[PDB]
Amino acid sequence: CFEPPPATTTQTGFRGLSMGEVLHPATVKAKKERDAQYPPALAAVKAEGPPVSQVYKNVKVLGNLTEAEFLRTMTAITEWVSPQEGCTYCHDENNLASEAKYPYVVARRMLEMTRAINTNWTQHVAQTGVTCYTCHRGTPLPPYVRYLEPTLPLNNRETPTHVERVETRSGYVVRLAKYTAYSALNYDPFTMFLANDKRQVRVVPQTALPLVGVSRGKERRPLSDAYATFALMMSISDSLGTNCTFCHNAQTFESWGKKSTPQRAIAWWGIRMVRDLNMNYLAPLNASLPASRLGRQGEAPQADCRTCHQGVTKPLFGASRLKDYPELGPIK
Amino acid sequence: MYHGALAQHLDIAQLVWYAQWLVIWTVVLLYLRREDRREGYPLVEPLGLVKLAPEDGQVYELPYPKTFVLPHGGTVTVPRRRPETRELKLAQTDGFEGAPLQPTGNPLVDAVGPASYAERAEVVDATVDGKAKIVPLRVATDFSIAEGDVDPRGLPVVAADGVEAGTVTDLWVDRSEHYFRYLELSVAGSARTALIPLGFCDVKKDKIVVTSILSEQFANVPRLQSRDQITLREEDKVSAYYAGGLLYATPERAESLL
Amino acid sequence: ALLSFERKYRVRGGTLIGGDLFDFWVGPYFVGFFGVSAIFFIFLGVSLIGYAASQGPTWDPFAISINPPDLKYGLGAAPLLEGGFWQAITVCALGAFISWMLREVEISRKLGIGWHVPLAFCVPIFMFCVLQVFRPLLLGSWGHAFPYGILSHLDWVNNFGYQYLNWFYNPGHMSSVSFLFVNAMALGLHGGLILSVANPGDGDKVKTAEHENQYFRDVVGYSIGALSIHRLGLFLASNIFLTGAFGTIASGPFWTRGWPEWWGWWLDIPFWS
Amino acid sequence: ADYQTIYTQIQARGPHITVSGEWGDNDRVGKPFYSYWLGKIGDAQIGPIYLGASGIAAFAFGSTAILIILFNMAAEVHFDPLQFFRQFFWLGLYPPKAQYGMGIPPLHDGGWWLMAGLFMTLSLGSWWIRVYSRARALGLGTHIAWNFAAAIFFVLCIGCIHPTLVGSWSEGVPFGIWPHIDWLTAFSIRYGNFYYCPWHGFSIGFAYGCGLLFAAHGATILAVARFGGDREIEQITDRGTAVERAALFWRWTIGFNATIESVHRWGWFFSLMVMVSASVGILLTGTFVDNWYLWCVKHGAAPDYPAYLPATPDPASLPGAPK
Ligand code: BCB
Ligand code: BCB
Ligand code: BCB
Ligand SMILES: C/C=C1/c2cc3[nH]c4c(c3C)C(=O)[C@H](C(=O)OC)c4c3nc(cc4[nH]c(cc(n2)[C@@H]1C)c(C(C)=O)c4C)[C@@H](C)[C@@H]3CCC(=O)OC/C=C(\C)CCC[C@@H](C)CCC[C@H](C)CCCC(C)C
Ligand SMILES: C/C=C1/c2cc3[nH]c4c(c3C)C(=O)[C@H](C(=O)OC)c4c3nc(cc4[nH]c(cc(n2)[C@@H]1C)c(C(C)=O)c4C)[C@@H](C)[C@@H]3CCC(=O)OC/C=C(\C)CCC[C@H](C)CCC[C@H](C)CCCC(C)C
Ligand SMILES: CC(C)=CCC/C(C)=C/CC/C(C)=C\CC/C(C)=C/CC/C(C)=C/CC/C(C)=C/CC/C(C)=C/CC/C(C)=C/CC/C(C)=C/CC1=C(C)C(=O)c2ccccc2C1=O
Ligand code: HEC
Ligand code: HEC
Ligand code: HEC
Ligand code: HEC
Ligand SMILES: CC(C)=CCC/C(C)=C/C=C/C(C)=C/C=C/C(C)=C/C=C\C=C(C)\C=C\C=C(/C)CC/C=C(\C)CCCC(C)C
Ligand SMILES: CCCCCCCCCCCC[N+](C)(C)[O-]
Ligand SMILES: CCCCCCCCCCCC[N+](C)(C)[O-]
Ligand SMILES: [Fe+2]
């Protein structure tokens, strides 16, 4: 089980600290190629005519677009999400205003979510932004999603073995391990940290000596909190295809300033962005999804870092369509 | 308020750091380094002009004597004064104090340099139940060579010069540890046996090769007082003889390798 | 100035190079050609350290740090202040260590004893080369080597380990640690046994070779023997670095992922997946 | 070369020796047998072994501890045998995940862990008695038992005493191959980086030093095996050329030297101090120091470096950062 040299290495800290990325050139190439499948922008169209708010019947989100512009969007959406199924994945082919098929109503929510990420989470996505393709990658079910229990394979386009199946109790420890970069950490950092905003990720004291009043008995956080955070961090690392030193100087994980890279602050915003998407857009979709979509607790599939990043420090190596599709944000 | 905070930015851990160093230096200097001086001290000097008393320092560096009570009777106390009265056939190569000495005679026979032995007791090392510990298999009759290993008895011993020097007639076994320690050989053309420590023997199927000394030099291997016993000092004499060959067997052995 | 038994041993000869020229003692120390070169390199390396440290922000001994170049300099020479001092000190360090090793051979030869100690001492010298020379060469930059600072070299070990997510799962490290632990236990056991035999307490008699064998035969069912425990200790200790060296060299040049995932070779056998 | 220092060229076989103890001679069970290949690099005789009460007690307690662990591990893969064998390293028996303070945790959340720790402790105690007794039975000093006692004390510090001192069973070491390893990182993270704990530094220094010392001592005795340096007891009571030469090798090299007795005291002391330093470090952690790096920063010891990428302010502290 080994990877032949050369390794690609970068430097992310002062010389002599052994901080930076360590990459296997073939793995990077394979990912570059997968991500290179991002369809190009459709040709621009001239904005002629009334807004489709007048033209069409049931346009709630993109009503300000002209007809040519709107149909360009629908064509782009079909290509990103349901290329194999076509327009009828969401539409009644005899009534295009029909909301009868669930992908339609889910897609409307996804236009809102997408415009929200690009408008309200620029702290994270900056001017790269996301499109439907960033998560979906050409299928209606995005390849990397999370339920409220760990599932395997991580990529749901792959067929599970019996042991991988979430019903097979004996495969639990491996389902957990493969979500935490093969560690044995007995914690699921998705449901603990990313599904909602209940839990505090920071566990390290900010004083040298123990403060009287928080340092004894039931006053204390259990040591289990530090395992869980390490588990989250193993997961974040694997999700972006990187290591701790991409973000931290391990001298002091808890410190910022010179002890942290700009990427750590971008990751901080990502945690907040993921929690927002999950609490406010994705988790509620269980009301709208077929039962076949839902997990064993009736949860809709939700997002973690891998959902976008898919093993790369920037999703799709930083590819952008933000200028090509202003409809998708930022929305002034 | 803080657990451990003592005052000024004194805190418990900070004080224990000092205590830790103190404990380590105390044990190292005042205990271990004085245990280190139970042999060989006090240091000696050529022609001490005069010393009406030992330096205070010679008293301070020594531990109190300890006495071992030996398993088969007697005691030994260390440190104790052990001058080496024995005359050494060595001369100063130069007047400088750190100058090497050099053999004025035959260093192997004179037992100087790598051919030195220690003034061990002239007693036969014993087993736990009082028997001679290192004895020939002619005597240690319930001991044997493990099946699979060369029986060297009968084999020629070939010295550094490629010449055969004698014939192995016996092995001496450590009856306390079940471990062979010497071979005994009849020295060709002399009327004597010689022991040779097994560490100086390359044991082959058809010969015992010995590169420490030339065939000629077996003539002068130290002789034991008995034929079936060996004293601690004799073991030192015999072992040291071959070790001396490593530097002295030929003129060129003492000079630079490269 | 001489141990009471020392004079008879202080003869000329035994040198690897130089012969009579440096064949003498200064106090208790043998000199030899390699004592001269050891001193030369120590003196240089220590001068370079002082000069470098003086050019830096601190004189606190915990905080001083002389660091390798940025990665971008590859395997070339760096400016003195930005890695060049470090490069020079590394050369003086290697020079000092190897001289020290060869001086030990000359001392061994003069005494008529085996060369086992200088040989054993090659193992730490080798490990220094793995960290500072071989692994940086394989990765293509001096900048991968560790800095010279009492605490800063710990920060390098820390980040190096965490570059592979959890270094504890590194199979060469598991082996390394295991030898470190057995060796420490074994040294306490060996030292304790010899002391327990020579120092039974009260006015009891010193015990015997047979007692040593009996004690471990009783306690664990096996005694390795008096000569063999010394061979074993040399083996256990040496393999701390000899096995560790594989885990160090593998990380980067032969494995770029976290170490826990490496065990996928086992976990993911399709028979039980 | 001295080939003996590599392996035994000609092995000897002889009648098997027994050194009688003040008690328990009738508790030696087994017939010695001899391994020829073992005999090449060690003594060839394996066995007999002494039984005795403390030894049998140790096995009983130890086995119980092991059964509690293995049963809990089996439950983890839901008693699937093949998955059990597959996943064994990953499986563990854990301390309480929830904060119960010093409350005895539910069986399902730390109760079994506590039970296994108790039996392990009784196991270690019984074995210490065996280690101590056999020395006394054979008329030997108790130096081994006192070295062993420091190791046991360290296990107690990380298993029991530190959790008690901060008041939480949640801090104990899990049983399991990878799980006991994950604890090392979790504990270091919680307490602000164990590299900056001075007693972690002391322990390492003594552990590396044990490596140095046993390589040096082992090699030193092999180098003078031609002079019988291996027979260390009689080299102690009657100095021979073996340890004169050994002492002088070191005096000429480093300028000072030990005796053949005292180098075993240095070794015993270095070994002990690995465990003594580790214990002190654990006893201070959490009790009196919360973040070892910050403690070093407080006392001026920590190094600092320029930023290489831009220094990055905590976003959480920004004006209007969400929570
Ligand atoms: C977060 C990161 C971690 C980490 C990262 C780490 C790395 C990255 C590496 C190790 C390595 C090693 N680690 Mg691990 N580690 C170890 C133990 C060990 C060592 C056995 C092993 C070898 C060390 C070495 O190379 O020395 C080197 C010592 C040398 C080269 C000494 C040279 C001496 C020289 C020849 C002479 C010097 C002379 C002076 C200049 C002269 C002074 C003069 C005065 C005295 C007069 C333990 C016991 C633990 C525990 C219990 O937690 C642990 C945890 C961890 N390690 C963490 C998980 N460790 C190494 C290894 O082998 O990994 C597989 C390694 O590369
Ligand atoms: C891969 C892992 C590595 C590692 C990991 C490590 C850890 C994790 C820790 C140490 C610690 C220590 N290390 Mg580091 N280390 C050190 C030296 C040191 C000491 C500062 C200290 C205690 C060592 C000890 O007692 O060993 C056994 C040797 C003994 C008992 C003989 C005495 C040796 C003497 C104390 C060495 C003194 C060195 C001088 C400060 C160096 C400069 C002197 C020159 C300028 C004259 C050297 C000289 C080297 C070289 C040349 O390779 C080295 C390499 C490495 N160490 C590797 C990079 N080391 C501990 C520490 O406290 O750091 C602050 C500690 O926590
Ligand atoms: C990211 C995490 C880190 C970490 C975290 C860590 C912790 C949390 C602790 C250590 C500790 C220690 N570390 Mg550190 N560490 C060490 C080295 C060391 C050791 C010297 C020392 C452990 C002492 C020991 O021998 O335990 C092995 C010996 C043991 C366990 C004794 C066992 C005795 C017992 C009687 C045996 C009984 C066996 C029975 C058969 C059991 C029966 C089974 C049952 C089920 C019946 C090195 C050399 C390095 C390097 C090179 O980087 C390093 C890095 C780091 N450590 C990282 C900074 N380390 C300890 C310490 O010293 O802290 C102050 C400690 O607690
Ligand atoms: C710095 C110094 C150190 C140091 C020191 C010392 N270390 C000592 C001594 C000294 C001085 C001794 O005197 C004592 C000893 O005696 O040595 C010969 C001992 C020891 N160090 C051991 C292990 C060790 N040291 C470690 C570490 C350090 N040590 C550090 C480094 C580590 C680490 C590194 O993790 C480990 C793992 C053991 C071998 C031994 C204790 C045995 C015990 O306490 O056992 C207790 C007894 C038991 C657990 C019972 C075992 C039952 C088993 C066999 C399972 C049976 C199951 C059954 C078959 C099921 C039946 C089913 C049925 C249906 C059929
Ligand atoms: C696996 C086997 C092991 C093993 C074995 C053996 N070990 C030996 C021998 C054997 C057999 C000897 O024969 C020889 C000796 O004589 O013993 C008394 C020796 C010795 N082991 C020392 C240190 C030691 N062993 C370590 C480890 C192990 N040892 C492992 C465990 C460690 C660590 C860190 O673990 C340390 C620090 C010295 C005391 C001594 C060399 C003196 C020297 O070489 O003199 C010559 C050099 C000098 C006096 C100074 C040189 C200064 C340079 C030029 C400038 C500084 C550069 C430097 C790189 C800066 C680093 C900064 C730092 C904070 C990052
Ligand atoms: C810029 C600058 C600084 C310039 C000048 C540099 C300088 C140092 C100059 C000196 C010039 C001089 C005076 C002379 C030239 C001759 C010369 C080459 C001198 C060398 C000076 C020098 C470099 C000294 C450093 C010595 C050194 C490396 C010491 C380390 C000692 C240490 C820390 C050892 C660690 C191990 C340890 C704890 C050992 C203690 C226990 C001992 C002593 C074990 C050894 C030992 C063992 C292992 C046995 O098994 C044994 C068995 C039976 C009998 C005896 C022994 C025995 O003694
Ligand atoms: C689901 C993933 C869809 C796919 C694939 C396509 N369409 Fe769509 N379309 C979808 C939604 C959610 C909406 C409403 C947009 C809003 O702002 O609320 C629509 C709307 C249209 C309309 C307007 C119909 C009307 O309301 O009068 C048209 C004309 C339309 N869509 C066309 C269309 C075509 C031709 C497609 C394939 C090229 C296509 N859509 C795919 C969701 C989805
Ligand atoms: C990741 C942050 C996403 C972005 C950006 C977009 N989508 Fe999405 N979508 C995502 C998830 C986690 C899910 C839930 C799981 C599921 O497949 O239901 C979805 C689902 C949909 C669906 C329904 C798919 C189905 O159940 O058949 C549709 C039709 C859909 N998404 C459309 C869509 C569009 C049009 C987007 C860009 C405007 C878009 N999604 C972005 C995650 C993410
Ligand atoms: C950036 C993409 C990161 C990588 C890779 C790793 N970490 Fe991280 N870590 C990051 C952030 C943004 C945060 C703070 C989260 C918040 O909500 O505030 C953290 C935090 C930690 C902590 C806790 C620090 C504290 O103040 O208590 C630890 C101990 C930590 N991280 C460890 C760690 C390790 C060991 C990693 C590699 C396995 C790792 N992190 C990677 C961002 C990033
Ligand atoms: C899609 C909706 C995403 C999810 C979910 C997460 N991230 Fe992200 N991230 C996303 C984009 C579009 C970009 C590129 C922005 C840009 O600056 O070009 C990023 C970028 C990062 C980075 C910056 C990497 C770098 O500067 O080299 C980091 C460190 C990062 N993202 C971390 C991160 C984490 C840890 C997440 C889960 C909590 C996470 N992201 C989710 C899009 C999306
Ligand atoms: C005050 C109160 C109420 C109680 C306090 C009680 C007390 C003293 C508690 C102490 C707790 C302690 C000492 C906990 C210690 C935990 C520690 C140090 C654990 C460390 C590591 C454990 C590990 C590595 C062990 C894992 C276990 C295994 C893999 C199982 C072993 C099983 C075998 C190999 C089977 C062998 C037989 C087979 C081949 C047939
Ligand atoms: C850890 C608690 C002790 C459990 C009981 C262990 C059995 C004790 C056996 C005592 C044997 C006494 N003897 C023979 C040495 O005197
Ligand atoms: C970090 C652990 C440090 C342990 C202390 C090292 C002991 C070295 C002892 C050498 C002292 C020599 N002398 C001659 C001055 O006594
Ligand atoms: Fe010894």
Tab-separated table of N, CA, C and O in Angstrom, chain A residues 197-244:
chain	number	residue	atom	x	y	z
A	197	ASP	N	-26.184	24.068	14.926
A	197	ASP	CA	-25.249	24.953	15.608
A	197	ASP	C	-25.227	24.767	17.114
A	197	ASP	O	-24.886	25.686	17.842
A	198	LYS	N	-25.548	23.565	17.573
A	198	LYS	CA	-25.663	23.299	18.996
A	198	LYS	C	-24.341	23.167	19.744
A	198	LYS	O	-24.264	23.506	20.926
A	199	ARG	N	-23.291	22.814	19.033
A	199	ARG	CA	-22.077	22.337	19.669
A	199	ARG	C	-20.955	23.315	19.407
A	199	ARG	O	-20.901	23.959	18.364
A	200	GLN	N	-20.065	23.469	20.378
A	200	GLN	CA	-18.950	24.374	20.208
A	200	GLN	C	-17.758	23.497	19.803
A	200	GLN	O	-17.540	22.427	20.383
A	201	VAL	N	-17.089	23.870	18.710
A	201	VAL	CA	-15.939	23.112	18.221
A	201	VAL	C	-14.679	23.294	19.080
A	201	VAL	O	-13.915	22.347	19.276
A	202	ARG	N	-14.503	24.478	19.661
A	202	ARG	CA	-13.295	24.761	20.430
A	202	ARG	C	-13.336	24.075	21.770
A	202	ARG	O	-14.391	23.987	22.363
A	203	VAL	N	-12.239	23.403	22.118
A	203	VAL	CA	-12.136	22.642	23.365
A	203	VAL	C	-10.920	23.043	24.210
A	203	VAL	O	-10.781	22.572	25.332
A	204	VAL	N	-9.989	23.808	23.646
A	204	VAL	CA	-8.715	24.058	24.321
A	204	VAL	C	-8.875	25.298	25.192
A	204	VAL	O	-9.366	26.322	24.730
A	205	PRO	N	-8.394	25.242	26.441
A	205	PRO	CA	-8.424	26.407	27.339
A	205	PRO	C	-7.629	27.586	26.802
A	205	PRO	O	-6.606	27.427	26.145
A	206	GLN	N	-8.094	28.783	27.113
A	206	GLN	CA	-7.395	29.978	26.682
A	206	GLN	C	-6.602	30.656	27.812
A	206	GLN	O	-6.099	31.764	27.643
A	207	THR	N	-6.437	29.954	28.931
A	207	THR	CA	-5.567	30.397	30.014
A	207	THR	C	-4.556	29.304	30.312
A	207	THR	O	-4.851	28.122	30.131
A	208	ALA	N	-3.410	29.688	30.860
A	208	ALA	CA	-2.394	28.739	31.259
A	208	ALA	C	-2.848	27.837	32.417
A	208	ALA	O	-2.631	26.623	32.373
A	209	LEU	N	-3.461	28.417	33.451
A	209	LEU	CA	-3.869	27.660	34.637
A	209	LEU	C	-5.358	27.391	34.574
A	209	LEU	O	-6.086	28.110	33.889
A	210	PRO	N	-5.832	26.330	35.238
A	210	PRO	CA	-7.269	26.057	35.255
A	210	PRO	C	-8.045	27.114	36.066
A	210	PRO	O	-7.767	27.310	37.251
A	211	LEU	N	-9.030	27.757	35.444
A	211	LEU	CA	-9.902	28.703	36.135
A	211	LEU	C	-10.805	27.993	37.131
A	211	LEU	O	-11.445	26.987	36.821
A	212	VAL	N	-10.758	28.446	38.373
A	212	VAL	CA	-11.631	27.924	39.416
A	212	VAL	C	-13.077	28.218	39.063
A	212	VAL	O	-13.440	29.372	38.809
A	213	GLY	N	-13.904	27.180	39.056
A	213	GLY	CA	-15.293	27.365	38.690
A	213	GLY	C	-15.695	26.655	37.417
A	213	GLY	O	-16.872	26.461	37.183
A	214	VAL	N	-14.731	26.268	36.586
A	214	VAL	CA	-15.040	25.465	35.394
A	214	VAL	C	-14.135	24.228	35.286
A	214	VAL	O	-14.208	23.484	34.305
A	215	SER	N	-13.357	23.941	36.320
A	215	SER	CA	-12.267	23.009	36.145
A	215	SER	C	-12.381	21.748	36.936
A	215	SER	O	-11.438	20.984	36.979
A	216	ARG	N	-13.514	21.508	37.573
A	216	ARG	CA	-13.616	20.302	38.390
A	216	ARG	C	-14.964	19.628	38.237
A	216	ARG	O	-15.985	20.306	38.093
A	217	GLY	N	-14.957	18.300	38.190
A	217	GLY	CA	-16.198	17.536	38.211
A	217	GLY	C	-17.148	17.860	37.079
A	217	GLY	O	-16.715	18.136	35.953
A	218	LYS	N	-18.437	17.945	37.392
A	218	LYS	CA	-19.444	18.193	36.373
A	218	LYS	C	-19.339	19.604	35.772
A	218	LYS	O	-20.003	19.901	34.786
A	219	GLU	N	-18.474	20.460	36.309
A	219	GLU	CA	-18.310	21.782	35.721
A	219	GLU	C	-17.599	21.654	34.395
A	219	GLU	O	-17.534	22.629	33.639
A	220	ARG	N	-16.861	20.552	34.243
A	220	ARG	CA	-15.951	20.367	33.105
A	220	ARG	C	-16.672	19.781	31.899
A	220	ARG	O	-17.489	18.865	32.035
A	221	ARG	N	-16.277	20.214	30.709
A	221	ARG	CA	-16.580	19.441	29.512
A	221	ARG	C	-15.882	18.076	29.571
A	221	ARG	O	-14.763	17.948	30.095
A	222	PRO	N	-16.574	17.020	29.118
A	222	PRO	CA	-15.937	15.702	29.144
A	222	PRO	C	-14.822	15.622	28.089
A	222	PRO	O	-14.810	16.412	27.128
A	223	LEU	N	-13.837	14.750	28.318
A	223	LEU	CA	-12.689	14.641	27.407
A	223	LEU	C	-13.167	14.198	26.027
A	223	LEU	O	-12.571	14.567	25.006
A	224	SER	N	-14.351	13.598	26.003
A	224	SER	CA	-14.961	13.151	24.778
A	224	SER	C	-15.116	14.293	23.799
A	224	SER	O	-15.023	14.070	22.593
A	225	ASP	N	-15.268	15.520	24.291
A	225	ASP	CA	-15.366	16.683	23.402
A	225	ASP	C	-14.122	16.918	22.580
A	225	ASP	O	-14.212	17.311	21.426
A	226	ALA	N	-12.962	16.655	23.161
A	226	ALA	CA	-11.720	16.823	22.442
A	226	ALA	C	-11.553	15.736	21.362
A	226	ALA	O	-11.128	16.041	20.249
A	227	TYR	N	-11.944	14.495	21.647
A	227	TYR	CA	-11.997	13.458	20.593
A	227	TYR	C	-12.898	13.872	19.433
A	227	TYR	O	-12.558	13.653	18.281
A	228	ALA	N	-14.089	14.370	19.738
A	228	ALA	CA	-15.053	14.720	18.716
A	228	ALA	C	-14.519	15.803	17.811
A	228	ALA	O	-14.674	15.747	16.599
A	229	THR	N	-13.894	16.807	18.402
A	229	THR	CA	-13.281	17.869	17.616
A	229	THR	C	-12.163	17.325	16.731
A	229	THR	O	-12.016	17.755	15.588
A	230	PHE	N	-11.347	16.419	17.254
A	230	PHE	CA	-10.279	15.832	16.457
A	230	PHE	C	-10.926	15.060	15.291
A	230	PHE	O	-10.550	15.259	14.137
A	231	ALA	N	-12.031	14.363	15.578
A	231	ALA	CA	-12.790	13.639	14.559
A	231	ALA	C	-13.319	14.574	13.497
A	231	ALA	O	-13.117	14.329	12.318
A	232	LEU	N	-13.897	15.700	13.895
A	232	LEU	CA	-14.307	16.695	12.907
A	232	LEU	C	-13.143	17.149	12.046
A	232	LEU	O	-13.285	17.359	10.844
A	233	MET	N	-11.984	17.314	12.660
A	233	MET	CA	-10.844	17.844	11.947
A	233	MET	C	-10.214	16.816	11.027
A	233	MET	O	-9.774	17.168	9.940
A	234	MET	N	-10.289	15.540	11.392
A	234	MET	CA	-9.874	14.455	10.490
A	234	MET	C	-10.792	14.458	9.261
A	234	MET	O	-10.347	14.362	8.115
A	235	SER	N	-12.068	14.688	9.511
A	235	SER	CA	-13.055	14.667	8.471
A	235	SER	C	-12.880	15.836	7.509
A	235	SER	O	-12.977	15.660	6.288
A	236	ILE	N	-12.678	17.036	8.053
A	236	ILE	CA	-12.452	18.252	7.258
A	236	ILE	C	-11.205	18.068	6.380
A	236	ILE	O	-11.237	18.312	5.178
A	237	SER	N	-10.140	17.547	6.970
A	237	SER	CA	-8.919	17.286	6.241
A	237	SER	C	-9.157	16.353	5.058
A	237	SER	O	-8.768	16.663	3.940
A	238	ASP	N	-9.787	15.213	5.298
A	238	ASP	CA	-10.060	14.266	4.224
A	238	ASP	C	-10.993	14.851	3.161
A	238	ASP	O	-10.751	14.693	1.970
A	239	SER	N	-12.000	15.600	3.595
A	239	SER	CA	-12.949	16.225	2.687
A	239	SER	C	-12.308	17.183	1.729
A	239	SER	O	-12.829	17.377	0.635
A	240	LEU	N	-11.282	17.899	2.172
A	240	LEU	CA	-10.639	18.850	1.283
A	240	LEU	C	-9.371	18.271	0.659
A	240	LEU	O	-8.671	18.972	-0.072
A	241	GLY	N	-9.033	17.028	0.986
A	241	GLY	CA	-7.797	16.462	0.473
A	241	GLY	C	-6.543	17.165	0.968
A	241	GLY	O	-5.588	17.394	0.211
A	242	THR	N	-6.526	17.491	2.260
A	242	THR	CA	-5.415	18.237	2.834
A	242	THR	C	-5.109	17.760	4.248
A	242	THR	O	-5.581	16.696	4.661
A	243	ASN	N	-4.173	18.435	4.908
A	243	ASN	CA	-3.747	18.050	6.246
A	243	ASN	C	-3.847	19.263	7.173
A	243	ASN	O	-4.083	20.380	6.710
A	244	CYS	N	-3.699	19.032	8.477
A	244	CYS	CA	-3.892	20.055	9.500
A	244	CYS	C	-3.112	21.339	9.241
A	244	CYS	O	-3.626	22.430	9.479
